[PDB]
Amino acid sequence: QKMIASAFNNALGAIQDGFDATNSALGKIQSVVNANAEALNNLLNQLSLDLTYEMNRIQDAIKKLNESYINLKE
Amino acid sequence: QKMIASAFNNALGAIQDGFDATNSALGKIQSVVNANAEALNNLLNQLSLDLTYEMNRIQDAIKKLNESYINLKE
Amino acid sequence: QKMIASAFNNALGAIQDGFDATNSALGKIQSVVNANAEALNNLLNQLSLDLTYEMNRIQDAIKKLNESYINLKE
Amino acid sequence: NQKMIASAFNNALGAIQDGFDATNSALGKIQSVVNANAEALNNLLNQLSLLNVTLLDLTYEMNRIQDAIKKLNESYINLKE
Amino acid sequence: NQKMIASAFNNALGAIQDGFDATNSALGKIQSVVNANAEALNNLLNQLSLLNVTLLDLTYEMNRIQDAIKKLNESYINLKE
Amino acid sequence: NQKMIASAFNNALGAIQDGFDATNSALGKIQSVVNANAEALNNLLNQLSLLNVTLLDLTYEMNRIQDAIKKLNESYINLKE
């Protein structure tokens, strides 16, 4: 009970770290895929990715998780 | 108990949103990295990524999670 | 109780599969974005992405989750 | 006069449990087949992609019916008592 | 002599419950407004990005106060008893 | 004749608790060291990558032994009683 809630609280903390990391990962990727995309764009005019939604949804889920912790003294 | 299960059910709903978002994110990325890869491929023959497994595994985990909800009236 | 812990244990197993998959996904992406980045690099000198942190954090969260399972006989 | 009633009751308890045991084995078979066919369908939707499916969970019910069967066992009336 | 006391007590129980009912409806209003304004703020921080906010949870407390109000109902003294 | 037995028992209860207290502090030390060395190893496997490790959990057991020690305290026999 207090053991069940404690093990659930630990899990939560680890689920947010993972999504946190996932979100940090999606940022670097879009920054790079897009940096290189535009680079290849610059090269092509001489012969002449948007993860907003997903990242925000993950940020919202982390928020929701944080709101799921059980207050053991309760 | 009913409080513990309720807080666990909330968490679940938020874990699926996050994986949902992760899966949507992996799709856009592969579509782009591959669109640009083939673009750079077209350019190279003038001087002349597959996330199936992972996305499906995430879709399977979401399914499993949905199957983990506790029926409070039970 | 035993039903609550069992449903929590199932969830855990599915949360690790998902992060597992996410981590496998971040690897392929970096390998590709970087393979193509360097390819476009080779092409540019003829007219002449690092997900370490995030992937490891996700691997750490999976570890933490595995440590959250409830021993039903206890 | 109390024997005859008690006797007709006991006989009845035997048949009721027999009936609830049948009901529970039937639930078992239905949950398995329905879920097995649900996976077959969700698998197909997946390959076709490479409109949702639901699975059944009758554990609570099969457990209550199992409890009831054991409760009934307690009602048997020893005729010597 | 025991009637007068009992009478003054009952009257008192009525006012205490009245007071705890008010306290609980006040907690209700505060949790809602505070949380509603917290979302307004967390939403703004989000659009400005496109320094954290916390939400209130008074369920435990509102539940204890609700239990206390019902416990008090039990203390009423029937004068005929 | 009942004093001597009771006396030899009490003495015994003191030594048993003494023994279970030692066992529990030993479990404490083992869980910590084993887990600390497990992290050292899982850390190494990580840097070498930049074949799994397990951690110990003896909370249940240390808790049962702690309960037993307190139960034994209850068995002490007051000689005057």
Distance CA B66, CA B11 (A): 11
Closest B-chain CA to A66: B11
Do residues B64 and C10 lie in contact, with contact meaning Cβ atoms separated by under 8 Å? yes
Distance CA A25, CA C49 (A): 10
For residue E55, list chain A residues with Cβ-Cβ distance below 8 A. 67
For residue B67, list chain D residues with Cβ-Cβ distance below 8 A. 55
Give the number of domains in chain F. 1
Assign residue C2 the CATH number of its domain. 1.20.5.300
Count Cβ atoms within 10 A of the Cβ of residue F1 and give its class: 0-12 exposed, 13-18 middle, 19 or more buried: exposed
Closest B-chain CA to C1: B1
CA separation (Å) from B12 to B18, B73, C22, D52, E70?
10, 18, 18, 18, 34
Residue C74 touches partner F, C-beta closer than 8 Å? yes
Distance CA B36, CA B42 (A): 10
Q: Coil, helix or strand for E79?
A: coil
| Of the partner residues D46, D55, D60, the one whose CB lies closest to the CB of residue B67 | D55
Q: How many CB atoms are located within 10 Å of the residue C72 CB?
A: 10
Q: Coil, helix or strand for C10?
A: helix
Tell me whether residues E55 and A71 touch, CB distance under 8 A. no
| Structural domain that includes position B57 | 1-74
DSSP annotation of B67: T
Tokens of E3: 């009637």
Report resolution in angstroms: 2.1
Count Cβ atoms within 10 A of the Cβ of residue C59 and give its class: 0-12 exposed, 13-18 middle, 19 or more buried: middle
Q: Do chains D and F touch (3 or more CB pairs under 8 A)?
A: no
Distance CA B62, CA B17 (A): 9
Closest C-chain CA to B26: C25
Torsion of CA D46, D49, D51, D52, to 10 degrees: 20
Closest C-chain CA to A30: C49
Tokens of A36: 């290189």
Per-residue exposure over F2-41, b if at least 16 CB sit within 10 Å of its own CB, e if not: eeeeeeeeeeebeeebeebeeebeebeeebeeebeeeeee
Q: How many Å lie between the alpha carbon of A64 and the closest alpha carbon of chain B?
A: 6
To the nearest 5 percent, what fractions of chain D are helix, strand and coil?
A: 80, 0, 20
Residue C49 touches partner A, C-beta closer than 8 Å? yes
Do residues E52 and A64 lie in contact, with contact meaning Cβ atoms separated by under 8 Å? no
Do residues B7 and A70 lie in contact, with contact meaning Cβ atoms separated by under 8 Å? yes
Tell me whether residues B74 and D55 touch, CB distance under 8 A. no
Q: How many Å lie between the alpha carbon of C66 and the closest alpha carbon of chain F?
A: 10
Residue B28 touches partner A, C-beta closer than 8 Å? yes
Per-residue exposure over E14-52, b if at least 16 CB sit within 10 Å of its own CB, e if not: eeebeebeeebeebeeebeeebeeeeeeeeeeeeeeeee
DSSP characters for A14-62?
HHHHHHHHHHHHHHHHHHHHHHHHHHHHHHHTT-----HHHHHHHHHHH
Tell me whether residues A14 and C61 touch, CB distance under 8 A. yes
